[PDB]
A paper describes a structure:
SWI/SNF (BAF) chromatin remodelling complexes are key regulators of gene expression programs, and attractive drug targets for cancer therapies. The BAF155/SMARCC1 subunit is a component of all complexes identified to date, incorporated either as a homodimer or as a heterodimer with its paralog BAF170/SMARCC2. Here we show that the N-terminus of the BAF155/SMARCC1 subunit contains a putative DNA-binding MarR-like domain, a chromodomain and a BRCT domain that are interconnected to each other to form a distinct module. In this structure the chromodomain makes interdomain interactions and has lost its canonical function to bind to methylated lysines.
Residues 27–383 of BAF155 were expressed and purified, and their structure determined using X-ray crystallography. Residues 4–160 form a four-helix-bundle that resembles the MarR-like helix-turn-helix domain10 based on structure homology analysis using VAST:11 43 aligned residues, RMSD for CA atoms of 1.9, score 5.1, P-value = 0.0005 for the highest scoring protein. Residues 169–287 consist of a BRCT domain with a chromodomain (residues 219–246) inserted between the second and third strands of the canonical fold. Helix 2 that forms part of a phosphate-binding site in many BRCT domains is missing. The individual domains are linked via a network of hydrogen bonds to form a single structural unit in which a highly conserved stretch of amino acids in the α3-α4 loop and α4 of the BRCT domain plays a central role. Analysis of the sequence of human chromodomains shows that the BAF155 domain clusters with so-called “chromobarrel domains”. This sub family of chromodomains have an additional N-terminal strand that precedes the chromodomain fold: the BAF155 chromodomain does have a chromobarrel fold, but in this case the residues located at the C-terminus of the module form the additional strand. Residues 28–33 pack onto the chromodomain, and a main-chain to main-chain hydrogen bond is formed between Leu28 and Ile300 linking the N- and C-termini of the module. The N-terminal residues interact with a region of the chromodomain that in others forms an aromatic cage that binds to methylated lysines. The architecture of the fold produces a cleft containing two deep pockets at the interface between the domains. Analysis of the sequence conservation using ConSurf17 reveals two highly conserved regions on the surface of the module: the first on the MarR-like domain and the second within this cleft.
Numbering used by the authors: 27 to 210, 216 to 302
């Protein structure tokens, strides 16, 4: 099976971030930072490759501090998709901007993420990054409605998980981002192409486990992702698996219709 390639942890795909093409994609991020976070990046005047290296350090830090292997993590992982938004003014801009702003406000001389002596204030930096993403409408954490058929004990467990992962829950279905239904294999979905490589998403793994594999190992085309339609209809394992990975899972893997039947908007490819 192709799962021999599957990432064993949700740390950064270092080869992607060191690619010359990825470094060149950060040019517009660098330029945008020099205007909209000018007070906080002028000192360091970071290059495209320095920014790529900082992304790797930030991604490695949150996997080390908040990944699946951690018991009692102090924070929930930021969505991997946030780091892949290279548009001027997008999520990566605000992640890097917030990081440099926080460093400046704390008087740090350098970022020190690989250093175990420096985790409690690095955790606070990630809480600040998440606040900045929410405030700039790059990130919305789930506001969840539980369908009435979910029984009391299971609902109680789900509410605990939701709250511990920066989510909220509501009794007003029309205001919810997600509707959760009762739950009634080994597959992947290709999601991005770059030269002769394809990024694949593994079913029931979070996006930080997405893995770059050879294009000729996936005989399927990348289908367009679903257009966001409020609300997502997913079954309870979307929340239960979020607690395993300390990372909100991908709704597409858990989607159902209003009669709880599984929905696969994009085709699932057996591994």
């Amino acid at each position: 099976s192709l799962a021999v390639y599957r990432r064993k942890d949700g740390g950064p795909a270092t080869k992607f971030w060191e690619s010359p093409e990825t470094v060149s994609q950060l040019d517009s991020v660098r330029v945008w930072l020099g205007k909209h976070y000018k007070k906080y990046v002028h000192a360091d005047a970071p290059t495209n490759k320095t920014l790529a290296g900082l992304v790797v350090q930030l991604l490695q830090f949150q996997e080390d501090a908040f990944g699946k292997h951690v018991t009692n993590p102090a924070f929930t992982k930021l969505p991997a998709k946030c780091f892949m938004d290279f548009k001027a003014g997008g999520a990566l801009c605000h992640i890097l901007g917030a990081a440099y702003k926080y460093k400046n406000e704390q008087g740090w001389r350098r970022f020190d993420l690989q250093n175990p002596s420096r985790m409690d204030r690095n955790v606070e930096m990630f809480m600040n990054i998440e606040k900045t993403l929410v405030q700039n409408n790059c990130l919305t954490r789930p506001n969840i409605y539980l369908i009435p058929d979910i029984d009391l004990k299971l609902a109680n467990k789900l509410k605990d998980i939701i709250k511990r992962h920066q989510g909220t829950f509501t009794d007003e279905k029309s205001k919810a981002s997600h509707h959760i239904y009762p739950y009634s294999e080994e597959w992947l979905r290709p999601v991005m192409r770059k030269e002769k490589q394809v990024l694949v998403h593994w079913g029931f793994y979070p996006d930080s486990y997405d893995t770059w594999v050879h294009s000729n190992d996936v005989d399927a085309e990348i289908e367009d992702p679903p257009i966001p339609e409020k609300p997502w209809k997913v079954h309870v394992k979307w929340i239960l698996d979020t607690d395993i990975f300390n990372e909100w899972m991908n709704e597409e893997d858990y989607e159902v219709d209003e009669n709880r039947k599984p929905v696969s908007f994009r085709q699932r490819i057996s591994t």
